[PDB]
Amino acid sequence: GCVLLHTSRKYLKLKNFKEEIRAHRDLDGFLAQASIVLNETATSLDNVLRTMLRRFALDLLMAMLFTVHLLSDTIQGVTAVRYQQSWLCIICTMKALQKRHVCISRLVRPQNWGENSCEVRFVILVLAPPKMKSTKTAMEVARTFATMFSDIAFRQKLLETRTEEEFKEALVHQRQLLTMCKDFVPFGKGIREDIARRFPLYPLDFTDGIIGKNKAVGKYITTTLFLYFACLLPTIAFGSLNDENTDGAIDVQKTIAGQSIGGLLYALFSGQPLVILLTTAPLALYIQVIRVICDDYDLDFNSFYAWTGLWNSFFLALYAFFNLSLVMSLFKRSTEEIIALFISITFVLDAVKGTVKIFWKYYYGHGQATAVLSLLIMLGTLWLGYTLYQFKKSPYLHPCVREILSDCALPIAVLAFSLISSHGFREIEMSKFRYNPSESPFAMAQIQSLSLRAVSGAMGLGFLLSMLFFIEQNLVAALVNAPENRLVKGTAYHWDLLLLAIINTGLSLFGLPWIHAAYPHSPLHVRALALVEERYDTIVNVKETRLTSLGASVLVGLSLLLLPVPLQWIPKPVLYGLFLYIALTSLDGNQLVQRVALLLKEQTAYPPTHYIRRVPQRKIHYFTGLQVLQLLLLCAFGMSSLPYMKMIFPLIMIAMIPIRYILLPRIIEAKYLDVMDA
Amino acid sequence: GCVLLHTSRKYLKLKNFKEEIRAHRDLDGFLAQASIVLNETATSLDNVLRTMLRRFALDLLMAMLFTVHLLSDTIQGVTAVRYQQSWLCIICTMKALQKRHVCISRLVRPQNWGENSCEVRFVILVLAPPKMKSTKTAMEVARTFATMFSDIAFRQKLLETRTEEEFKEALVHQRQLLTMCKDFVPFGKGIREDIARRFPLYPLDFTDGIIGKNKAVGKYITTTLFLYFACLLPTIAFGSLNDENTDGAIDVQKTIAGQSIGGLLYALFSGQPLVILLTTAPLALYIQVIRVICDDYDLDFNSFYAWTGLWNSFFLALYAFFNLSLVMSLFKRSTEEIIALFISITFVLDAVKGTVKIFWKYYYGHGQATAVLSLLIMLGTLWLGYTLYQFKKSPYLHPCVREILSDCALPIAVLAFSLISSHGFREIEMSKFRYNPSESPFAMAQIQSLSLRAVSGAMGLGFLLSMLFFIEQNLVAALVNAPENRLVKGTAYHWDLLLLAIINTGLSLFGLPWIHAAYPHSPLHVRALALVEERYDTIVNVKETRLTSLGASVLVGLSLLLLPVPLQWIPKPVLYGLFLYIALTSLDGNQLVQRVALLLKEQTAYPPTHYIRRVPQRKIHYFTGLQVLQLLLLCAFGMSSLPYMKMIFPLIMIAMIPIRYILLPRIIEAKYLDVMDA
């Protein structure tokens, strides 16, 4: 009965006692239940293995060990390639075991058990159940002992030991050996250097995936379509929100026009073009507050709105000119993810609040079919978009066709349910955003009309706006420029901030809504243009190009000609489903979200991530809990009914840095915190 | 720089040229592009490998080969344990390759390359890309050549060859060598033997998981709860369907009472108690036809209904007494799955037809909020139930808590959305099944009242009913008794058929609806009580017990006391979601469904199933297409508007056997068809 024997040899990295705590935990567990065989007189591998098994407690266990050259799993040391015949590590997996059993047996005399086992003196048997954590599997536990025995000096010390207690002391002693401003002075250098880093690479932005090989034409078209829908609809909602707050001073037409002009300019004359500019709800809050201030006094809305925008741009220009973007590097992964998660929650709350608003107005008559259909459309749009989003991992279809279909998840879900609501349910009227003809012919707002005692108030709002703009712009840019994304071209933090002020001051003078780096869209824009290979998921490269951003801006601008059509065929629930879709898809890769899901996870399902290996689980869960506590602080201030607390929200984000670097070290060791950021 | 080398040795089964076609395909592909090196004068492994690589076309390729003892992957022959040093098979994986390259090099003289490679004469290098089908991976292709070279006689013949053409002929010649009634005579034995097989095991049915170790108390309670909801609701719909067809002759009270009494009796005095009895839509069609016949003539509905039930039981008694259940073994996996899929489609169509009925009555006013909410509730119930159903595979939660929560998918989904529709949407009226007080006091139907010329017509219906009962009872029992399910106790086909007639004749005399083996519930009952371990999914054992069936029947009977409560708090859309849930969950494991999904699958994602290995893909897809054609035949006859074609549906199922055993062999080879059944 001839059979085929498949032998596979792979190099395993030496266990890092300095960094990995599992080695120390496994050594302590072994010391607690030591099974050490001293002066084993058996001259054969079979007898030694049977003796070690008897120390553990049989032919049933002995048989499963084999399939030295007949052993199923073994680990041996190699010297840079000479094998280490001095010691041998035998590994086996048994389904009938509940714990991990490690036995170390020392032979009286060297034994010639094979080509690479001619001088065996130490035999290490590691038995573990198949169902165990990836950090404490049979291979991992053996690597802890293999690394210690890989030292020739340590093996010599073991041979000198005479008693079991001294043998343990050598193991403990070996473990100990293994275990053991100037910037801002040049004000202009930040702006100058960023231009110098980006200007030579400008032509490559328009020909990165168009000219030459690896033509990613389908990716660019899909990403532009994804950006077009993901940007036009929120601006429509924000434009309507401004319309009902400013009583027609700022409408859908101006909001979309500002987004198109600002996006087009940013896509052309800014480094790192993957950042997407969009108006946000906090910006709408400032516009609402400005209207309230202008209502209380005898002040023109456009004049006051322009002046605070001028001060906002002026302070942002100073921030770029003083190279203040460097201090934003203190926002490590610990703080960025919390702020990242908070913004995703806001989009979820906006959809929930909008659904309640529809139910309150229609279902309770402050009719019922509209509210019920609104819930169905919102849930259906989220389901269809998310199902298509996850379709990329499916084995179904041609890889190219599947990638195109999956990357078109948002455009297809919006269009499909827009037809369902508008055409399949014509008899049921649906809530839609208001549309009105042109009212303000893009005036200059008459900045000189406003007098003293009011520009100073605008300066205060402008300074507060600058704090919001400075933090948000750098946070999203840092997320785009995260080390996980390759982006070999470079970063243009200082130049982008200066251009953002230049874009904003133009919008403020014409009364257009302000726009800055929007958190959900930009990484999704990077994620859409990125190439991911299963291993877990790793981004090989990102197609850095201005075509997607520029193309989306043009399409949004062209939508102004046919503006009523989106405002009629696309109801609010479709937008609410879009908000749910982008919020959920933006959490794919969030460090805090994964650890939150980890809390609720069976131990055996814990992935072998870097932070789990280096940081104790107890400390990780404490860090996760503290981050959730910080998240609740953001929710209390950022999503409150009082407008003032929401306006001072950037101060809360600033206050997170002292908590991270002063308060958190007092609770959790600073070394563990640094690993989480890394 | 000391490193750790992990070597793993595993026995690989010799490639079966007789059964597996991939071996022949790989050998033909190698012959088409042969890379044979004859009389290699190199005395070192490195030079031979470099020469073979040059024949393929380098140090980059050479480096990836290693990490003989330094080779990453190798296959060697073992004699029952002596290694075969004559030949060696080297395996490597390269991401830069597009095809599979195999090279065979013969050495002039034996070389001593190691302990197990002291007489190397043949070197086999197999290079394949990582992304390939599981049947044609690097290991699989090497196994084809390893099996051929495992024969010492074949290696001697290769040494005798002088030219490359003769070397190919030896490879071809080696491939050829590797490639190359009485029953029914005892009428009563069927009934007697089944009782003898089940009577000694009767006490074990009530103490299989209650007394002793492995107490599966949570499984029994959950399964009883699952069966209670999965049975009570369809009987409610069928009872209402009978009420609107028979104009009050048969109502919800009688249908539930018949289900409870029939289920309780079957759970007690029947072998293989995992079979669940329930009324079906085709049975309701016969009741509707009986009412129409009784309306056309001057015949009592109860008298005619009882007589056809008497003949149905009489013919079923003869079928059990003549051991006719044996011929049902001809319904192999080829025909059972098609019938299995068809019944699942009927439950899907019933939910769809019911949804259209609600929309037609309410949305179009033949109001709108009811129809829209009905769609939302139906889709929501399916989503929540299916999400909880798939929660069992999740790493989330405690394994015990997760298993209990996931196995309660149907009860939780029904109860949760019943509260949502009845209590969360009180203002929106929902379609509900009719409830009326008791009208018929369980009479005996006065069988003797009916005269001649009408009992003969009942005999015709009874014979047609017997055909439906005989086929359906055996098909579901065969699915329960499938080889995948262990069920070490045995089978009681003949006894179950006789008892089914005894149960049915009692129901017919009292005017209760007939019940037989229901396809969706019974395997799900087996699946709920089964233990599944990931490998793919394999059922270790099934907890065979009568408690779940008996407990569910009692709960259904007790529901008659509080009958209005389910008929009010549970609307039709919740039931429609239940129909969608059971239909979809019943396809988990369907052979036809998996092959249908296979059609739409990328080649690299093809699982290494037995039928793929033995049967060509082209023939598999032809077999899948023919089965779909047979499915369309069932759909045309079984789900048509004409009642007569639906009544003769059992004839269509009978006609499938001649197609399988006479028509299918004419198109696809009989050997391939037998593999599909196996």
Curated annotation (Swiss-Prot), chains A, B:
This is Solute carrier family 4 member 11. It comes from Homo sapiens. Widely expressed. Highly expressed in kidney, testis, salivary gland, thyroid, trachea and corneal endothelium. Not detected in retina and lymphocytes. Changing residue 625 to S: In FECD4; does not interfere with post-translational processing; the mutant protein partially localizes to the cytoplasm. Changing residue 309 to D: In CHED; affects protein processing and transport to the cell surface. Glycosylated. It is linked to Corneal dystrophy and perceptive deafness: An ocular disease characterized by the association of corneal clouding with progressive perceptive hearing loss. Corneal endothelial dystrophy: A congenital corneal dystrophy characterized by thickening and opacification of the cornea, altered morphology of the endothelium, and secretion of an abnormal collagenous layer at the Descemet membrane. The keyword Acetylation does not apply. Changing residue 155 to P: In FECD4; interferes with post-translational processing; the mutant protein localizes to the cytoplasm. Homodimer. The gene is SLC4A11. Changing residue 506 to E: In FECD4; affects protein processing and transport to the cell surface; the mutant protein is retained intracellularly; coexpression with wild-type protein does not rescue the cell surface trafficking of FECD4 mutant.
